[PDB]
Amino acid sequence: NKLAVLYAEHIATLQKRTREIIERENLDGVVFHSGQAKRQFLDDMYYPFKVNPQFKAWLPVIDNPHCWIVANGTDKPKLIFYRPVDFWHKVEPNEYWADYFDIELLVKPDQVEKLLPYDKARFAYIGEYLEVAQALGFELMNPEPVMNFYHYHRAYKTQYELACMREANKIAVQGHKAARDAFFQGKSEFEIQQAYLLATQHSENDTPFGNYVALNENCAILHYTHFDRVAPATHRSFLIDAGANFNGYAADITRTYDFTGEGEFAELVATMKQHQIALCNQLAPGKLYGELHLDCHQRVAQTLSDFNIVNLSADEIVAKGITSTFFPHGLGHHIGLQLHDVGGFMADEQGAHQEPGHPFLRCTRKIEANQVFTIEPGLYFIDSLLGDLAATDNNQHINWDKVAELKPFGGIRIEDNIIVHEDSLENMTRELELD
Amino acid sequence: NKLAVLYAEHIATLQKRTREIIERENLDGVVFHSGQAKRQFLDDMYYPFKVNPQFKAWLPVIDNPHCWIVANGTDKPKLIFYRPVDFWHEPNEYWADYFDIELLVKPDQVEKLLPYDKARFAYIGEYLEVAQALGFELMNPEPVMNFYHYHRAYKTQYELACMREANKIAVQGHKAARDAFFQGKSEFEIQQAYLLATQHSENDTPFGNYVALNENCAILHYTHFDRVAPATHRSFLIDAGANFNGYAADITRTYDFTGEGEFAELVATMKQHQIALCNQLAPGKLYGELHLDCHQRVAQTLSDFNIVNLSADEIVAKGITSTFFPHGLGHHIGLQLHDVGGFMADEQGAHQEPPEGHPFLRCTRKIEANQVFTIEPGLYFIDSLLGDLAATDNNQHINWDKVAELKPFGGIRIEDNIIVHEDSLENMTRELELD
Numbered sequence A: 001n002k003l004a005v006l007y008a009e010h011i012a013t014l015q016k017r018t019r020e021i022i023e024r025e026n027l028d029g030v031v032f033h034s035g036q037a038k039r040q041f042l043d044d045m046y047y048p049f050k051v052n053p054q055f056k057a058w059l060p061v062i063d064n065p066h067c068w069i070v071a072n073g074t075d076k077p078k079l080i081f082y083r084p085v086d087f088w089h090k091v092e093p094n095e096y097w098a099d100y101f102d103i104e105l106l107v108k109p110d111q112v113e114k115l116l117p118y119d120k121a122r123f124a125y126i127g128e129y130l131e132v133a134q135a136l137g138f139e140l141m142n143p144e145p146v147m148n149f150y151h152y153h154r155a156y157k158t159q160y161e162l163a164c165m166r167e168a169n170k171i172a173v174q175g176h177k178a179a180r181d182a183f184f185q186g187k188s189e190f191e192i193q194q195a196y197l198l199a200t201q202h203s204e205n206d207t208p209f210g211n212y213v214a215l216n217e218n219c220a221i222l223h224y225t226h227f228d229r230v231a232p233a234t235h236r237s238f239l240i241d242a243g244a245n246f247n248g249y250a251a252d253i254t255r256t257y258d259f260t261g262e263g264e265f266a267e268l269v270a271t272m273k274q275h276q277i278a279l280c281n282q283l284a285p286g287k288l289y290g291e292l293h294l295d296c297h298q299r300v301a302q303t304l305s306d307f308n309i310v311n312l313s314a315d316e317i318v319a320k321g322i323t324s325t326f327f328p329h330g331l332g333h334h335i336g337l338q339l340h341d342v343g344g345f346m347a348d349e350q351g352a353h354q355e356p357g358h359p360f361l362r363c364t365r366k367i368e369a370n371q372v373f374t375i376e377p378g379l380y381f382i383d384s385l386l387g388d389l390a391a392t393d394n395n396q397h398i399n400w401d402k403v404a405e406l407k408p409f410g411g412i413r414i415e416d417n418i419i420v421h422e423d424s425l426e427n428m429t430r431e432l433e434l435d
Numbered sequence B: 001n002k003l004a005v006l007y008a009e010h011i012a013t014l015q016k017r018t019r020e021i022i023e024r025e026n027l028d029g030v031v032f033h034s035g036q037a038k039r040q041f042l043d044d045m046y047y048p049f050k051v052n053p054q055f056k057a058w059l060p061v062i063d064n065p066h067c068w069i070v071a072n073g074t075d076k077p078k079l080i081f082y083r084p085v086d087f088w089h090e091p092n093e094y095w096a097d098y099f100d101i102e103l104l105v106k107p108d109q110v111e112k113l114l115p116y117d118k119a120r121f122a123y124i125g126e127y128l129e130v131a132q133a134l135g136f137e138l139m140n141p142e143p144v145m146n147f148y149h150y151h152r153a154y155k156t157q158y159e160l161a162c163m164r165e166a167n168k169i170a171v172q173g174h175k176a177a178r179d180a181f182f183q184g185k186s187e188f189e190i191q192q193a194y195l196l197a198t199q200h201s202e203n204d205t206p207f208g209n210y211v212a213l214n215e216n217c218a219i220l221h222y223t224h225f226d227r228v229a230p231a232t233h234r235s236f237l238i239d240a241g242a243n244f245n246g247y248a249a250d251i252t253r254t255y256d257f258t259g260e261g262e263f264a265e266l267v268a269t270m271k272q273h274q275i276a277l278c279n280q281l282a283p284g285k286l287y288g289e290l291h292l293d294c295h296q297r298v299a300q301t302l303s304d305f306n307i308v309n310l311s312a313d314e315i316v317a318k319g320i321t322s323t324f325f326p327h328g329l330g331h332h333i334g335l336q337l338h339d340v341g342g343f344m345a346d347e348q349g350a351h352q353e354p355p356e357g358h359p360f361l362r363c364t365r366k367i368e369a370n371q372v373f374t375i376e377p378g379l380y381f382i383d384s385l386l387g388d389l390a391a392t393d394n395n396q397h398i399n400w401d402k403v404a405e406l407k408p409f410g411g412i413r414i415e416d417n418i419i420v421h422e423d424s425l426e427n428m429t430r431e432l433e434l435d
């Protein structure tokens, strides 16, 4: 396995990071709890299992509750692997990552008693279940200096992590091309989603987030969760925000399409595409991410002017803050183990927070090598926001006829995942030839 | 009758049940909380929303959190319908007219819409702390819970109609899944074919479907989906259902690939046993009586196929049947998959004790009209249970060579959903022509 080579360096890095923080916080070690299955109210059914990000940060075990990692950075990390024995289900770790842990099998969740350290006074519990931690004897639960430290360095992806994210993007792109074909065949939102799921070989709960699969006016809906079962009478626009998972690492890709490939909306999409590519290539070590977000508002304003959506020059559109009506979210975010990855705001290991008139900007941190970003500029026609704009004194400056013409197409978003290197950029998505 | 007509009676029934219990428990009214969405640990993603069964018992609103129902049985039930306004993104169907609807635009503003004096109002929901912080004191009082759960077993005509539709959808799925199997598709592909035909998302189904090929058919709670079709195609077991207005279907079918051979004959024999067991459903009979007969029929099957060298009675007497048939014959089904009240003897909550020999059976309540059951006899070749059998002195009575021949096929389960009427039975599943 070519992943195994990189995974050895991955463990050594996590061990190194663990050594530092437990010595800085005077701890014996850190305990990572994979998590638990949540039971539905008054029912014997369970919610789908979601693994603790801090747990899967160590190893690709993401579908197994009641697992525990005990690490101090010097000894080999101890893996308490849950493996029940009853005829109701079907199951020993055999993959390359197993050899880097001291594995002890747990046949029953409550038996974790005797496998955890006896003196837990200086062992930090990192997990969601504080009452379970209390029942075990842990009193140090999710201490902020430890949380902030790990979250800070999570931004710096190891070579193993980059490999996993490249693979995640490979899978996602395959899905996006299948979803694209389904759209031009005139399928419904539901049918398009199904085509995506089949092509990625992902179940719905495997994706890093509930995919957004939108047609026509629904393209304006940022968090569009529902899928229409019936195809629209006329096909105008298509927006799919969908990703994939590989070993716990996420991909997050958006593409917008015009059905006919010509007309005002098709040109608008093409314009946003060139803006999106230009914004991607502005990523560089030393740059604050906030500068890119600002440049995006500049480009959205320019776009509004050129297509005569707003009857003003680009800079007055910026100054009046009209751009926020059409582009109300952030340009992008860190991505990795979590979709919206941690540490996006922090300036140091101690958790120095850097804030963004742009409340929904998710990244303000200085860009460095081995960090991974999304770049997702957008231009939408949302009724609530357009109504607010009409209530302002900027009413007279808006081409409402133009807005009416473009409204049935919903909106535009184009998203890529980019690895920043020392002297180059790696746009994983477009290098996989997703136009 | 159409759903609109039937629903009028449904409300009148719930109103009546409510009047009786608040008078009995000296309450002013009962409050049903739909629930909330659960946020994932250290993340901004949420678990898929699962509605409170007690809430959706009143109306088909199953995807909307922060909803509240205030009822006393005499006045119209008040519905606090959550309808927020954000650019991230009103009831008008037949059921809307039966509620006094008050729109909630933000979840923390609910306090002004709830009763001023909440002392004698019973809170029925999962979020106790939320309720206590609102003023509620009575948290899911057991006499109220028991009362509702007991009468939940008696389905209104509206509820029966919903379940008929749920079964109609599921049957379409099973037919598509069956065809995919004979085409030699993988478990994953079969599941996706099922979802497409039912127009269900993975989280829309009442449970995670069990889609099993060959040896996997022996695993009762088989959750995984193999992405690669087995080199040899021998058997197929799909346990899958559907949802309609919050009401569930629960159907299992088992297939032999070639349609000939010992396993195919075993499937056909189990099918005739299953049909006969369905027809044993009758008002006045304890459900345990049917469970006992199932063990007798499984024993007779084992004997006839010479898997066990004993008569049926001997197989029963030595407790050998439980090796091949380890679970219950079935359960009540409705708003919940394993519906409530199936173990009750009265509305007070007293337990109807299971028949001797099966203390773990939890569907024991005396059968009555307008109740809905599953009938799912099974015969499996499970390694864990067969190992235990080999360790006992009954080892001598087992044709282990035949067991080894049948083991690669996994096991058999056949499940239908049946409505019990006054002097007739309605097998919703087989009425939709699913062999």
Ligand SMILES: [Ba+2]
Pocket (backbone or CB within 6 Å): A028, A122
């Ligand atoms: Ba010490």
Ligand SMILES: [Ba+2]
Pocket (backbone or CB within 6 Å): B026
């Ligand atoms: Ba009274």
Ligand SMILES: [Mn+2]
Pocket (backbone or CB within 6 Å): A027, A028
């Ligand atoms: Mn120490």
Ligand SMILES: [Mn+2]
Pocket (backbone or CB within 6 Å): A241, A242, A252, A253, A254, A376, A415
């Ligand atoms: Mn996205």
Ligand SMILES: [Mn+2]
Pocket (backbone or CB within 6 Å): A252, A332, A333, A374, A376, A415
């Ligand atoms: Mn994103």
Ligand SMILES: [Mn+2]
Pocket (backbone or CB within 6 Å): none
């Ligand atoms: Mn009547």
Ligand SMILES: [Mn+2]
Pocket (backbone or CB within 6 Å): B239, B240, B250, B251, B252, B415
């Ligand atoms: Mn079933």
Ligand SMILES: [Mn+2]
Pocket (backbone or CB within 6 Å): B250, B330, B331, B374, B376, B415
């Ligand atoms: Mn069942």
